[PDB]
């Protein structure tokens, strides 16, 4: 059973241990309760320059709310990432895979919204 | 090999307390409340309880670790006031305030369910 | 005591004493299997 | 291998969802509209349906220990 | 210095979810109560299971882990039943718990789904919810002809802390202020965001003004139920389970200051 110190990894050379896991009512949630099945920190973004990331984050969300398979394969010019937030502004979401989330202890707001959506991670 | 059973966060242990008081002598009129097996639930409504008493100077709630499954609050009050009566005054408060909820949403599904 | 084993290719439970060639009776299959034991394991569903 | 029972995110049935999504999908729905049907309209159970792999099918391609 | 006078607004009432909204309350005790719909609202499910065989292609801990997570009809049985803990019994009790057996072979040549439908209950209050008298059954495992599946499973008492196979609510969405007045968020792009389902501001306008003096008030609620408890009895209980946590922590609380 995954716990703290197991290493996952998504396709994007985004490795991380588990450093503590929280129940659902500690996890932030949407305001339709969705809550994270992780949560990774954004300052492993800027200097990897994984933006394949990101654009696949954004992809799956219009995959998982559009009933679809995502097309990620590398050089294809009818795929951007404008297309894909024009898609999934079309499913009542942030064109850019935003959402307020909530402060799962306190229930408040946070300030920032929070950049969250479908990704395929590995358990190594 | 290291997890903790799930139910060590609800469950106290054999001879350790639920609540434990310890004055705080930095200022006066203060304590600590160190409260075993809870965590955001309660520390969270007794805190925003107690900051609605105008005699209360302080309230706060920390979870010191994560990881451990204690609560803190610390409350400070007025001279002529109590932080052990503000946090009883507060779960009280907040007892009266949970029974009128469940008595209106009682009468609310009654209704709904009716007409 | 008869520690019955199953063949791997005819599927068939037959008994083996110890010291004999591991033979199934019925096609001669040379892998056989335990069957599962008779003891109450116990499994919290979580 | 086989359909989750909950969603991982939320913990909504999806155990017995897969046999009637099928039938949606032979039936000529888009998988969209498919989840549609079932009520899913969570993106997370979205994603629960319409990622899973049915390998229980492929693992009974082999016969058993035991006739 | 006193309690709030919540007052409850329910806009609907399915046997899936209820949704509805708690205003004159502070935001503290509705997240409270949203966490507590999840992690304090006890409900029925399996907890021990004994497989007396198992020739399906799923190991006895996939299976075990399958059947913990159907959801048992708990409505009125899990205020009667006790947990484990405080049953002075052995093991097991019918005051402290529910016996399942499950005992199905595939003979014939189709594949055989082993549903929830089998899973057999003693108690017939407490049973699987899709058996309850469509939505299909929830698939514990596909069986080949010869295999076989047949174990014995209790269940038990419990809340989503211990676990999230006892969590009532298949998704609690929370809500409060859908107009960003309290400004508790900062849209960079506020025109870029789609509108709540409960905001109340004409197309033009984005976000509504700023409050100064502004309080979360009218929280907004959809408590979905995975089937074991209804909606309404998710909430209920969520209430009173809240209030007795209160209440025994205030029990020792006056011991503690009697003490002193
Ligand atoms: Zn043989
Ligand atoms: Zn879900
Ligand atoms: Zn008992």
Request: net charge negative.
């Given at each position: 059973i995954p716990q703290i110190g197991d290493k996952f990894a998504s396709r994007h050379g985004q490795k991380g241990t588990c450093g503590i896991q929280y129940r659902q009512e500690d996890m932030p949630f949407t305001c339709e309760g969705i809550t994270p099945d992780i949560i990774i920190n954004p300052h492993a973004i800027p200097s990897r320059m994984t933006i394949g990331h990101l654009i696949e984050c954004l992809q799956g969300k219009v995959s998982a709310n559009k009933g679809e398979i995502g097309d990620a394969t590398p050089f294809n010019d009818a795929v951007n990432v404008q297309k894909i937030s024009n898609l999934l502004s079309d499913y009542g979401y942030h064109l850019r895979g935003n959402e307020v989330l909530?402060?799962?202890?306190?229930?408040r707001k946070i300030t920032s919204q929070i950049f969250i959506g479908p990704t395929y991670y590995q358990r190594l | 090999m290291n997890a903790p059973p799930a139910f060590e966060s609800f469950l106290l242990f054999e001879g350790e307390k639920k609540i434990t008081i310890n004055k705080d002598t930095?200022?006066?009129n203060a304590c600590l409340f160190t409260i075993?097996?809870?965590?955001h639930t309660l520390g969270n409504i007794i805190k925003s309880q107690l900051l609605?008493?105008?005699?209360?100077?302080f309230a706060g709630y920390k979870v010191p670790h994560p990881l451990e499954h204690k609560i803190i609050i610390r409350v400070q009050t007025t001279p002529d006031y109590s932080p052990q009566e503000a946090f009883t005054n507060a779960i009280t408060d907040l007892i009266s305030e949970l029974s009128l909820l469940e008595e209106r949403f009682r009468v609310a599904i009654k209704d709904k369910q009716e007409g | 005591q008869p520690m019955i084993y199953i063949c791997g290719e005819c599927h068939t439970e037959n008994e083996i004493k110890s010291r004999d060639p591991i033979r199934c009776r019925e096609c001669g299959y040379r892998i056989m299997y335990k069957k599962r034991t008779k003891r109450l394991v116990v499994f919290d569903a979580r | 291998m086989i359909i989750p029972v909950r969603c991982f995110t939320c913990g909504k049935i999806v155990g017995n969802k897969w046999e009637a999504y099928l039938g949606l999908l032979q039936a000529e729905y888009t998988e969209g509209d498919a989840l549609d049907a079932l009520g899913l309209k969570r993106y997370c159970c979205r994603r629960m349906l319409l990622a899973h792999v049915d390998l229980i099918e492929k693992l009974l391609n082999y016969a058993p220990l035991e006739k | 210095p006193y309690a709030n006078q919540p007052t409850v607004r329910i806009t609907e009432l399915t046997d899936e979810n209820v949704k509805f909204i708690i205003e004159n309350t502070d935001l503290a005790v509705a997240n409270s109560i949203r966490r507590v719909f999840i992690a304090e609202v006890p409900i029925i499910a399996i907890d021990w299971v004994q497989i007396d065989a198992n020739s399906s292609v799923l190991h006895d801990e996939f299976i075990a882990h399958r059947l913990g997570l159907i959801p048992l009809?708990?409505?009125?049985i899990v205020d009667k039943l006790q947990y484990s803990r405080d049953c002075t019994c052995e093991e097991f009790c019918p005051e402290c718990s529910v016996e399942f057996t499950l005992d199905v072979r595939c003979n014939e040549d189709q594949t055989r789904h082993v549903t929830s439908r089998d899973l057999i209950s003693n108690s017939p209050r407490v049973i699987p919810v899709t058996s309850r008298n469509e939505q299909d059954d929830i698939l514990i495992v596909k069986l080949r002809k010869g295999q076989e599946l047949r174990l014995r499973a209790y269940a038990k008492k419990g809340f989503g802390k211990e676990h999230a196979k006892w969590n009532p609510t298949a998704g609690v969405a929370f809500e409060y202020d859908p107009d960003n007045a309290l400004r508790h968020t900062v849209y960079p792009k506020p025109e870029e965001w789609p509108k709540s389902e409960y905001s109340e501001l004409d197309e033009d306008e984005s976000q509504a003004p700023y409050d100064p003096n502004g309080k979360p008030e009218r929280f907004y609620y959809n408590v979905e139920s995975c089937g074991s408890l209804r909606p309404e009895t998710i909430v209920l209980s969520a209430l009173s389970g809240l209030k007795k946590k209160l209440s025994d922590l205030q029990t020792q609380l006056s011991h503690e200051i009697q003490s002193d």
């Amino acid at each position: 059973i995954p716990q703290i110190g197991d290493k996952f990894a998504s396709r994007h050379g985004q490795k991380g241990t588990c450093g503590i896991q929280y129940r659902q009512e500690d996890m932030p949630f949407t305001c339709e309760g969705i809550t994270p099945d992780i949560i990774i920190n954004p300052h492993a973004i800027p200097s990897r320059m994984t933006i394949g990331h990101l654009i696949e984050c954004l992809q799956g969300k219009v995959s998982a709310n559009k009933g679809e398979i995502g097309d990620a394969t590398p050089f294809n010019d009818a795929v951007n990432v404008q297309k894909i937030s024009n898609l999934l502004s079309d499913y009542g979401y942030h064109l850019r895979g935003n959402e307020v989330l909530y402060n799962g202890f306190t229930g408040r707001k946070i300030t920032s919204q929070i950049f969250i959506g479908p990704t395929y991670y590995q358990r190594l | 090999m290291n997890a903790p059973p799930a139910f060590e966060s609800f469950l106290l242990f054999e001879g350790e307390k639920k609540i434990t008081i310890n004055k705080d002598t930095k200022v006066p009129n203060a304590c600590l409340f160190t409260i075993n097996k809870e965590d955001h639930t309660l520390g969270n409504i007794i805190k925003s309880q107690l900051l609605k008493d105008p005699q209360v100077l302080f309230a706060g709630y920390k979870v010191p670790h994560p990881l451990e499954h204690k609560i803190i609050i610390r409350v400070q009050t007025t001279p002529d006031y109590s932080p052990q009566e503000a946090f009883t005054n507060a779960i009280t408060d907040l007892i009266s305030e949970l029974s009128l909820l469940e008595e209106r949403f009682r009468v609310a599904i009654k209704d709904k369910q009716e007409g | 005591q008869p520690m019955i084993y199953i063949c791997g290719e005819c599927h068939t439970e037959n008994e083996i004493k110890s010291r004999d060639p591991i033979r199934c009776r019925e096609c001669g299959y040379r892998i056989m299997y335990k069957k599962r034991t008779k003891r109450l394991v116990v499994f919290d569903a979580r | 291998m086989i359909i989750p029972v909950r969603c991982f995110t939320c913990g909504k049935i999806v155990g017995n969802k897969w046999e009637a999504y099928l039938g949606l999908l032979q039936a000529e729905y888009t998988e969209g509209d498919a989840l549609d049907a079932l009520g899913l309209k969570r993106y997370c159970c979205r994603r629960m349906l319409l990622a899973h792999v049915d390998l229980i099918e492929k693992l009974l391609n082999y016969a058993p220990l035991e006739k | 210095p006193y309690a709030n006078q919540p007052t409850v607004r329910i806009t609907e009432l399915t046997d899936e979810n209820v949704k509805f909204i708690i205003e004159n309350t502070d935001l503290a005790v509705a997240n409270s109560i949203r966490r507590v719909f999840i992690a304090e609202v006890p409900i029925i499910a399996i907890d021990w299971v004994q497989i007396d065989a198992n020739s399906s292609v799923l190991h006895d801990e996939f299976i075990a882990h399958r059947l913990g997570l159907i959801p048992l009809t708990s409505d009125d049985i899990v205020d009667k039943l006790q947990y484990s803990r405080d049953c002075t019994c052995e093991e097991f009790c019918p005051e402290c718990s529910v016996e399942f057996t499950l005992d199905v072979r595939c003979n014939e040549d189709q594949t055989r789904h082993v549903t929830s439908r089998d899973l057999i209950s003693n108690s017939p209050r407490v049973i699987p919810v899709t058996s309850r008298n469509e939505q299909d059954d929830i698939l514990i495992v596909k069986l080949r002809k010869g295999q076989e599946l047949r174990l014995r499973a209790y269940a038990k008492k419990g809340f989503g802390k211990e676990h999230a196979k006892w969590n009532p609510t298949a998704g609690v969405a929370f809500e409060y202020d859908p107009d960003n007045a309290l400004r508790h968020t900062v849209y960079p792009k506020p025109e870029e965001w789609p509108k709540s389902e409960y905001s109340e501001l004409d197309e033009d306008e984005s976000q509504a003004p700023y409050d100064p003096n502004g309080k979360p008030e009218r929280f907004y609620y959809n408590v979905e139920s995975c089937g074991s408890l209804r909606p309404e009895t998710i909430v209920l209980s969520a209430l009173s389970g809240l209030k007795k946590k209160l209440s025994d922590l205030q029990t020792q609380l006056s011991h503690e200051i009697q003490s002193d």
